[PDB]
Amino acid sequence: QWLWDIIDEFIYQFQSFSQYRCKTAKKSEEEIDFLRSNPKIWNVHSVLNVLHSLVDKSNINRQLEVYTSGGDPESVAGEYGRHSLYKMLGYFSLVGLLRLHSLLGDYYQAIKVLENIELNKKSMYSRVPECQVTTYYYVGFAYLMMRRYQDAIRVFANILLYIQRTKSMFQRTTYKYEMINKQNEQMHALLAIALTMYPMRIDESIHLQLREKYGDKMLRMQKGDPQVYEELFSYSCPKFLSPVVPNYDSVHPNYHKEPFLQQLKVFSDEVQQQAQLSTIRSFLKLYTTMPVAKLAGFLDLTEQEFRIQLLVFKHKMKNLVWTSGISALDGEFQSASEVDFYIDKDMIHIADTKVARRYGDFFIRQIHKFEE
Amino acid sequence: SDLQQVGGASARIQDALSTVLQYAEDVLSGKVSADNTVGRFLMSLVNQVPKIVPDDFETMLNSNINDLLMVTYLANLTQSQIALNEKLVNL
Amino acid sequence: AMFEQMRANVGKLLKGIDRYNPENLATLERYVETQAKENAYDLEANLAVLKLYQFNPAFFQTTVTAQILLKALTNLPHTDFTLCKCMIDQAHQEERPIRQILYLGDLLETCHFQAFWQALDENMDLLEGITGFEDSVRKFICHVVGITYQHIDRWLLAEMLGDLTDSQLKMWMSKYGWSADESGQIFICSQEESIKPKNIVEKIDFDSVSSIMAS
Amino acid sequence: GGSGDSAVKQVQIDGLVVLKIIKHYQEEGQGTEVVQGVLLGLVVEDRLEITNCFPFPQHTEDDADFDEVQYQMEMMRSLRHVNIDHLHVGWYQSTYYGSFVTRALLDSQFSYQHAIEESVVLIYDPIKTAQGSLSLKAYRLTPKLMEVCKEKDFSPEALKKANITFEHMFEEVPIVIKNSHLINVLMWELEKKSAVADKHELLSLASSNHLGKNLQLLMDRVDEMSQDIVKYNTYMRNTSKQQQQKHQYQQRRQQENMQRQSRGEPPLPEEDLSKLFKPPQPPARMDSLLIAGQINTYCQNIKEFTAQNLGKLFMAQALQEYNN
């Protein structure tokens, strides 16, 4: 008790709100202009909008926990409660934008992602900073999925910066905000490991204390001590298709046991080779075009014994991220060295100290005008 | 902004002046009052702007581009440090 | 000339209402059968099949799982084996020819082709059945070298490509706008194409900051 | 168009006013804040057209003691004989600083603006600001401050006036925009030192060729800034550390003393309850030091926005020009 009739209440009024929100959002504009007129408060039905989307994503996954096989919950939610509200007369608000967010909650959860084209196609509307922080949250995942870390890092540094003036402050994020920030820590830690030396992007979001933390963390993973491969994914296992968090752990039932084995077995595949490619590249770019003596003299740490040293290093040299080369009778082992500076980070941070003063002005200046 | 407009206006006087005193001697007998008067003052333009073509001095400047950014950054941060510190008086 | 027939069926499922339900493992099995015929790809096709296999591991096939695997592997260096194993569970990963072509993916997505085509079964139930597997994988083979490698040897290309000396070495060689180098290796592209630095042209960014600092 | 708050207009300083200013420019008082006169204008269409202003001579050997009003009373008699009456619509200085609002002179500016609300107070800037952005700063003081008068007082009339929160900087008016035709003959002086006696026009373009090349222009200014931001900023924060050594850190222990005694005795006083809560010296705000603290730190940042752009435009020019 204190679980199941609540599950019913939530999911019944979810699919009932899906009914009268799908039907009166397609052709007519009567409800539209009456919800404009009567409640000028443009708030409580941007609240309904997001709150129910979050508890829907959670509670249908709470029903999935029991109905693993031939399970109605995710089908009836994902098709009619998400994709019928998707195909809609694009309303003049953050309603149509939140419908495609509300389904992308499930479309990231269940990992059949490559109409990422259509997710950013259908909205020709103003992605509100409150909503575009969620877009970064949503799309950044789809580009760590596509085996492109070097430009998927471009998505997460800006949201853990939270630089785009985020405040609401009407129970709207909602009720799970610092856990969202903690998942944003997982994603920036993820895009730091196999990339450093390359960024030049663990400056802005992650700062010196928990930067050197995730430094010592990711570099001991890079050294080949997999305590951090272990810890990162041990505390990131549900974080890719979690409900919001599962209901209640007991002893007996096998149904509950399947979806957590499901989230283990399929995305443990992703992280095994993440830490492999990290440890393959780990070691520094010491010398440029090494002679075959210096090639083997560096494979003394990198990979020897003995035979098949050179040809397993070929397996380490064909990655799209390892520019090497072997000239035969010249006997020249060519290798690249991709560097970056640091002092070039003061171009829009300087505009941000300007807007930070203007922000320090805002709250106190309306106080002044209201008091006056 | 406007003393750079008149700095450009000076540079218009140069080009319109230098072109005609050239093309006058392309025709016949120009660069008379412009042989080693403006010819000396073309040399006087380039005496102190620009410097010959020294890329070592361009690096000196490119580090100048770093230190003004800093002078300018310190500048707009102490703008923030006005309301930041000085006005939590304002609560 | 069969993916011209079916892409309509693919696109109307692709943007449809029958991707989650145990309803549509019939038509996109047969579009990717056609993809296997004439070397066209679309992740969404097999994605909808592996989708309702994730939904309820009960309908999951074996040789059609190999059709998902091969057509995801043959289209390298695209990232398709990620969303293969993101739905193929340990429940699904312990049969044949599943766990064979799962390990073939472990080899191909990190480049281990000599050991692939060495311990490889010379012909599979699927090899010529899905025509273009050999060339498309061996296109990717030469691509990772051509992109991030300066000087390839004649023997080490032939060794890496798999169990060959000179003939198909020079076939895979000359077809890529490659030049022969003096007695004897292959020139694939520039040797100063090694370093590849794109951003140390910093410090001319007065313009972009000044844009705000006029006021 | 050029109205402030109810009474005031903008100022219009034609160039013939500017020249009696820069005669007593930054000399007869170089490192001495000479109040270089009172802006004798008049009230015409949208603008306080200044016509003639007289430089006030503070006893300037090394300091500035206020000289005779008999000077001002004969300079007004003097201007009345041939020119306008003493329609003082502001006062002006330069004087040895780049964009600073002097607090004691801001009180001289406040009572001036309480007397005549139609007033903007000029801060001239010659090349000492390093040229440099905003040279003529006709800075008037907030009318919401001129409302809560007098003046900015320290402990009382600080929280009260900073709940009213009158602005700190307000209405640095646009000065000299239009062909007023006072002009006339200094135009007719341009066409002659455009013409064959042109030796003097170049020598003004010389004050261009021995400005830059040699003058610490960034460094010595940044060193004087390197002195200003270490004393002024730490002191405001020493204020904003001493104020809540008293606001909370005291009232943390003041209520700790009060709450401990069960908040009084039933049958008697309530002796120590009346004794406890003795208000600290800054109970609220300290918004008198601080407002001009707002102004002068915001003024640090105009010098800083000066040291911003003055810089940039060399780094532009010498990366531009050099590169050929």
Q: How many CA atoms lie within 13 A of A277 on its CB side?
A: 24
Identify the CA nearest to A55 among candidates A243, A260, A240.
A243
The token pair at A123 is: 């909205």
First-last CA distance in chain D:
47
Resolution number, Å: 3.5
φ/ψ of residue D278, rounded to 5: -95, 115
Does any CB of chain D come closer than 8 Å to the CB of residue C210? Answer: yes
Distance between CA atoms of D106 and D145, rounded to whole angstroms? Answer: 11
3-state class of C172 per DSSP? Answer: helix
| Interchain pair B76, D240: CB under 8 A | no
Distance between CA atoms of D297 and B84, rounded to whole angstroms? Answer: 11
Q: A67: phi > 0 → left, psi -120 to 50 → alpha, else beta; which?
A: beta
Sign of the C-alpha dihedral, residues C143, C144, C147, C149? Answer: negative
3-state class of A351 per DSSP? Answer: helix
Alpha-carbon gap: B81 to the closest alpha carbon of chain A (Å): 8
φ/ψ of residue D235, rounded to 5: -70, -45
Q: Which chain D residues touch B74 with a CB distance below 8 Å?
A: 304
Distance between CA atoms of C104 and C98, rounded to whole angstroms? Answer: 10
Do the strands D47-50 and C179-181 form a parallel or antiparallel pair, or are they unpaired? Answer: unpaired
Q: How many CA atoms lie within 13 A of B17 on its CB side?
A: 14
Give the chains touching B; criterion: ≥3 Cβ pairs < 8 Å. Answer: A, C, D
CA D224 to chain centre: 18
Residues paired with A332 in a beta bridge: A291, A327
Sign of the C-alpha dihedral, residues A97, A102, A103, A107? Answer: positive
Strands (E) located in chain C: 151-153, 179-181, 185-187
Determine the residue among B59, B66, B80 to mutate to test chain A binding: the one whose Cβ has the most chain A Cβ atoms within 10 Å: B80
Distance between CA atoms of C154 and C183, rounded to whole angstroms? Answer: 10
Strands (E) located in A112-225: none
Q: What angle do CA D301, D219, D307 make, to 5 degrees?
A: 30
- With tokens 């699919």, the residue in question is A15
Alpha-carbon gap: C209 to the closest alpha carbon of chain D (Å): 10
The token pair at A334 is: 């060519």
User: Using an 8 Å Cβ cutoff, are D48 and D120 in contact?
Assistant: yes
| Interchain pair A324, C17: CB under 8 A | no
Amino acid residing at D208: S
User: Using an 8 Å Cβ cutoff, are C87 and C28 in contact?
Assistant: no
Distance between CA atoms of A14 and A10, rounded to whole angstroms? Answer: 6
User: Using an 8 Å Cβ cutoff, are C113 and C73 in contact?
Assistant: no
SS3 content of chain C, % helix, strand, coil (to 5): 50, 5, 45
Alpha-carbon gap: D224 to the closest alpha carbon of chain A (Å): 23
Burial bucket for residue D193 (CB in 10 Å: 0-12, 13-18, 19+): middle
- Technique employed here was cryo-EM
Distance between CA atoms of A191 and A294, rounded to whole angstroms? Answer: 32
φ/ψ of residue D244, rounded to 5: -105, 0
φ/ψ of residue D50, rounded to 5: -75, 145
Residues paired with D79 in a beta bridge: none
What residue of D is the nearest CA neighbor of A350? D308
| Interchain pair C210, D315: CB under 8 A | no
Distance between CA atoms of A220 and B62, rounded to whole angstroms? Answer: 38
Identify the CA nearest to B82 among candidates A182, A145, D300.
D300
φ/ψ of residue D44, rounded to 5: -120, 180
The token pair at A9 is: 């209440």
Distance between CA atoms of D57 and D67, rounded to whole angstroms? Answer: 6
User: Using an 8 Å Cβ cutoff, are C81 and C46 in contact?
Assistant: no
Which residues are within 8 A (CB) of A43 and not within 5 positions of it... i.e. 6 or more apart? Answer: A170
Radius of gyration of chain A, Cα coordinates, nearest whole angstrom: 25
Do the strands D10-13 and D47-50 form a parallel or antiparallel pair, or are they unpaired? Answer: parallel
